[PDB]
Design a protein around this nucleic acid. Sequence first.
RNA 1: CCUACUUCACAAAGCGCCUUCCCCCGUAAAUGAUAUCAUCUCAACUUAGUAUUAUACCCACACCCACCCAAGAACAGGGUU
Lengths: 38, 177, 162, 38, 39, 156, 174, 108, 42, 99
Amino acid sequence: FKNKTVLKKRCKDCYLVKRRGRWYVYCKTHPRHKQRQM
Amino acid sequence: SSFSRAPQQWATFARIWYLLDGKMQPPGKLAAMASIRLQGLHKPVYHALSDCGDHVVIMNTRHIAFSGNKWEQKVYSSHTGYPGGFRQVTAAQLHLRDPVAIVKLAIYGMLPKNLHRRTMMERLHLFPDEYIPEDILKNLVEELPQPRKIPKRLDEYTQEEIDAFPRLWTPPEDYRL
Amino acid sequence: FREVVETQEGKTTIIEGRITATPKESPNPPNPSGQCPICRWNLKHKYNYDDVLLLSQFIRPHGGMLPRKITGLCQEEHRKIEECVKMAHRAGLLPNHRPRLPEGVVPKSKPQLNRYLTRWAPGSVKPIYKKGPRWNRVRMPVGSPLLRDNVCYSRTPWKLYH
Amino acid sequence: GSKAVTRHRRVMHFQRQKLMAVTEYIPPKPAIHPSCLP
Amino acid sequence: GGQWRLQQGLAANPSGYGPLTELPDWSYADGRPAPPMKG
Amino acid sequence: GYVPKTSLSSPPWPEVVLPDPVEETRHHAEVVKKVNEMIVTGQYGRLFAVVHFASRQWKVTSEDLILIGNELDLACGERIRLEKVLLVGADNFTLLGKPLLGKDLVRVEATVIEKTESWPRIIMRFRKRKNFKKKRIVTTPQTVLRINSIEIAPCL
Amino acid sequence: HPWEPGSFRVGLIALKLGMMPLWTKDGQKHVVTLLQVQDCHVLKYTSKENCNGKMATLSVGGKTVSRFRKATSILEFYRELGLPPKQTVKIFNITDNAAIKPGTPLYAAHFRPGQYVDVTAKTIGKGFQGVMKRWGFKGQPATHGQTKTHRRPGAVATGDIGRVWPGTKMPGKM
Amino acid sequence: TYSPLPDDYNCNVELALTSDGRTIVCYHPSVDIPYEHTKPIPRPDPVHNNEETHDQVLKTRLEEKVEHLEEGPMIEQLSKMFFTTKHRWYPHGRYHRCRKNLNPPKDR
Amino acid sequence: KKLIAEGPGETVLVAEEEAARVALRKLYGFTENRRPWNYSKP
Amino acid sequence: VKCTKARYLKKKNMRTLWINRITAASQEHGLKYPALIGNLVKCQVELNRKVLADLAIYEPKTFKSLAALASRRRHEGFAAALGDGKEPEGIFSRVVQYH
RNA sequence: CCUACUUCACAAAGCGCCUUCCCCCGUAAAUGAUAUCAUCUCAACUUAGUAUUAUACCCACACCCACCCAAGAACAGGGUU
Ligand SMILES: [Mg+2]
Ligand SMILES: [Mg+2]
Ligand SMILES: [Mg+2]
Ligand SMILES: [Zn+2]
Ligand SMILES: [Zn+2]
């Protein structure tokens, strides 16, 4: 997980979800892409 | 009337016991009426030095309702004198610890901040459930009406009312829901 | 409506889709020129989260929401209805539209914290520990901003952050 | 004080703030929403 | 107070320009009118 | 113009239907007749009045005293008619003016009982670090009026 | 009543006799304290609902004292109970199934070897003590120039606060 | 019909306007509390001091009520009885006691 | 079954005594609402 | 200096007390203070806060009649805002003209 | 806390001895709509997930000159059968 103010999908397998009142970018193919809104 | 003067004065300045119900009411809307009748601001004979306060008995305070997400956002804060003594709890934690603290704190906040506040709070009686002592019950007069309107969940709807309400849209017959 | 029923009999699973009864619209809607059901029945800006009689005609048997292509609502009324039904679900209304689950309701959680007009999901909002200064206080959202255009009779606007 | 041109938005006199609050743009409002009517 | 008084054309302050202000306060009990008030 | 019943379909307040004007006019006529016959028979006792006097409104009854804060150019013992009566109420009925009741209806009498001055009132002005200090003593004139009677006439 | 898993029984009042050495079968040495039960009786029993509704209580008395130097109410209580007055009375929280009749004697064999107990007592009073002995505060050097400041507490707070916090450690009765 | 205020408490109010229209007439007779809305006065007759031997033993027993309390418990008892706070019952100094008017003015 | 007078009190007995006093005042026509004495000349 | 300055506060505080007492009485009758004051003005009955509180304490029948009149005038105002008069514009309306 | 040891000695101490008990939240996962797939859910909901509605202490209204005390600056407190 990396904190970002702007989140963008870095590949086709990244998906944006709204969890615990926050926007996350979750990727199962490259776990490198995991981002968390700040 | 003609009310010989001592009985007339006693009747004029007599204390009244009011019964107020919780059970889904907003604690602040309960506290507004409680503060009014604890100060005596509901009597045309009101004065600050006349000590014309009344008793307010609020029951079912464990079943109050908060609007919005105040159960998780509202923080009650205090401080023991000692260093490291700052305490902050949510409304949910405070309610689970004490089933009268929320309404008590609301009424304390709305009451005027002079030296009369503790007497007005001594004239306040709070109970978390339907049980009230027999002496207080024998004292009770003129139960106040509830400020909130109990938004009447689906299952208690008297099927005549369902038939009265119209169907806004016809759905497809080949749908699974 | 339509339903799927599965009958297991002699190592053979019959899967059938049957058609059941369906409720139609009322004979004389007041505004047949409207496009949405809300516009047709003049309910625009006239419903709140208390109107379960109106909300439950748009929702699945397990508390879920129905899509616009089925309901016929416009984009705006769809969001209004969905937020209102979320608030109704969080307010303890709609007791018979509970989520389906085999046995998970036995471990009862914290008792009935009575609430209404609950905007956010109760398990994902942090306590306000600092409240900010007087000129910028961290307020508490009560109700939904998508109902700001509802009919007002109080001569004072509804308070969304208080 | 400050110059007439600054980098920090230079908060206004309260009369000017009231003037700006009172002279805001108000878009027209149709009697019936365009989507509702046919 | 009264701004509706202005719509009736009646001196928003009810203490001027009306009988309540311009009429004599009192008179003798036998009927003789009182001397005019200073205001 | 039909709307299904909701929480916002209809205004929260109850729907009020005021009475029909002509039948209400007849009802007003009969009520005034009943109050007038009560007046003519004398079915009242110890009524009070609200009187505008000396820029003030006084809730007066019979036998009591009123202190007004200026001279009146009347001798002590002089009887006076207190005009400008805007309310007069007995037991079971009350008459209101718009804004004053008629001359023929009410008659309030008051006698001048005492012409005096008030106790000394101190008027002190002070400002710090400015050598600013002033002092006055004032005694305003005062008149005491005893209300003797409040009569009502059947001219209703 | 039979013993249930979630049950609690009564304690006793003992007298501290002294300390003794003791040795275990592996040769280790442990110091022990001797507690003598002089005259221990159950004095009164309050019901579950008559104190706080949380647990029943049993009052237990200590060693016997003289009747000539006790309060008259205490004398009446002990006369009704039919026992000598006790120097101390201590209250034990018990479950309802462990209650014993008032006036019963309690003996040391109430506790069995191979058991862990809790011992409460008033510790030795040292009077008004300085901060060094009371709180283990380090003092100040002895000879390098110090002026009448060998056992002082030093600073008590900071300057910004302008006061002393309630929990501050200072000289006092110990 | 129509009534501005409910006519069941304190008054039966009818509002009329005269034909001239210059004066408002308010009629308002009092409403009596009806008999169906009252409860009977209790009549307690407690008699349990009669023992089979004497008759003045109860006369002696009548003066058996006496009790004394110190300041703390007495003030707590008074506060509980009158629903006040404890500070009401502590005494005041001679300055305050002697600067209080003992012959105040009387109205009516 | 018709109410003739009422009275307040701290106890029921004193309230009843006050009600009796009010009833006596009404019966004898000596009330606080009675016609004030007419001081005039014939 | 305090004695001289206290006259303004005495006037203000006595008016505030009258307003509180009138609010209490009006809420006893179910009305609100702004509604009562406004509609009493609209009925051309010019009673001040002092005498209004006096009547609320000592003449409850008269105060109930006043509150009923104010409520009637308020309902007539609502009906007027609904129907633009047409016909009678209300009965406790129809202000009296002076010249 | 003083039975050994040690400074000491009808005591006080350490250099000596004895005892010391619940979590805390960021995420990781089921079912599942809006958006009939999928989706950990500022959707309703199910788990790891809450230590607390904690238990231990302490809680006897007036014998008191005086004497003693392991109690103590004074006062207070314990004992005097
Ligand atoms: Mg050293
Ligand atoms: Mg030196
Ligand atoms: Mg030295
Ligand atoms: Zn990716
Ligand atoms: Zn539409």
